[PDB]
Every structure is written in C-alpha cells, then in structure tokens.
C-alpha cells in the first residue's frame, strides 16, 4: 500500500573451507536483500525433494541501512561435512510479489564453489571452415 516491488536479490553463500577442517558439520546460507515489502517465504529444495522446516531457521526482515525502503533477510541451513563431500547440491527458493514468477532458484555444490583447478582443453581446427 505504497511500497514499490523492487527486485528481491538473492545470493547463496557456502560454508567456509576452514569450517571443513574439523569434519564436524557445514553451514549453507541464502540471503535476500533490496526488496519491498516484507512477508517473503523462503525454503530449500533438495533435488526437488522438500526439506524439513525444523532443520533450518530463517530470519525476520529488517530495514536496510542505506535504503530504508529496501529490506533484507537471511536463511541458514546446517548439514554434515560428508554430505558435501558426496556433493548433494540444494537450492534456495524465494516468494516475493516483485518477481513476475515470484520464484528464483540457485545451485551450490563442490564444483561451483571456488574451483581451484582449471582444466581447460579447448581444441581448434579447420581454420578455413565451410561457411558459405
């Protein structure tokens, strides 16, 4: 009733590598920032399988410092380290009226998280080509 439906930006952050040293657990999070108004629903899907609500705790929106109209919130999930050692990517969903689809998804796993090795083996051949 007087708030513009600004694009709700969603980011995914994986557990730090230092946390994966004692081999105890891990912690993924998804943050939503720069949106209006409040009442945004967020949860995680595990390869299309719904996740138990009690396994994770989300935050409550609060006004953004720089832009009072924009709000932001966080959602945090804790998993075992061997679960990520086996891959098992997840995705964080959003439910805000600003998006025409009201939903966006992401993907986080070992491969997408800071690839230290770059195996690039591009092949180029037939420089003349058949382009007519």
């Amino acid at each position: 009733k007087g708030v513009a439906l600004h694009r709700p930006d969603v980011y995914l952050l994986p557990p730090a590598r230092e946390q994966l040293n004692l081999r105890e657990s891990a912690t993924i999070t998804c943050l939503v920032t720069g949106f209006s108004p409040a009442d945004v629903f967020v949860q995680w899907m595990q390869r299309g399988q719904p996740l138990s609500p009690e396994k994770y705790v989300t935050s409550a929106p609060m006004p953004e410092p720089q832009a009072p109209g924009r709000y932001f919130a966080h959602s945090i999930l804790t998993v075992s380290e061997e679960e990520w050692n086996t891959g098992e990517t997840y995705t964080c969903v959003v439910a805000h009226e600003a998006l025409p689809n009201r939903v966006t998804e992401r993907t986080v796993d070992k491969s997408t998280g800071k690839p230290t090795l770059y195996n690039v083996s591009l092949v180029m051949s037939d420089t003349a080509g058949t382009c007519y």
């Binding site: 629903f41 439910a95 689809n101 966006t104 195996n119 591009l122 180029m124 080509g129």
Partner: protein, 106 residues
Amino acid sequence: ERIVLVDNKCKCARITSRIIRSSEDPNEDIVERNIRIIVPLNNRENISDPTSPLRTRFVYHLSDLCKETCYTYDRNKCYTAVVPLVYGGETKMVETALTPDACYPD
C-alpha cells in the same frame, strides 16, 4: 571491407574475413581471418539442466557451426523448470525464471 561469414551466437563465434590492399605492388592481395570466441568459464555441460558436470573439455569445429550442445546462452531463448512452492494457503503453481533478464517473456 570486412565480410562476416557466420555469426553463430550459440557458440558465440564471429568468423569473418577481410582483404588488405598492399602498397604499390602487383595485386596479389593478402587474405586475413580474424577469429574471436567466448567461453563461459563457469557453466556446465548442460546449459539449462542443473545436473551436468562443469564444462571441462571444449570443442570448436570451425565448419560445423557455419551450417550441437551450444555452450553460451542466448539473448532471449532459455529453458526453465517449475518449483513445488505453495506460498501458504493460496496455492501458487508458478513457472520460474532460471536465467534473469534472459528468461523474461518475449
């Protein structure tokens, strides 16, 4: 005068050729071929389905593309899936947007 042979955007290649007039010499003009490619560096074997491994080996046949899992995205074409999100009591079986600014209706 630069002539563009093929500008296939699925592989994001700009194959094109030019002729360069030499100095006061017999007109055996040289032939030149500038090529430029773009690699995502962060995408996967399947550009839409979020299950394929990361893009490791790349093949660029400079004749095949001039006529097929093209690597990069497109300005408008994209593939998208559907989430089981319910949004409380009011059920919302809503189609999604995997690529922002690229999966917009067009």
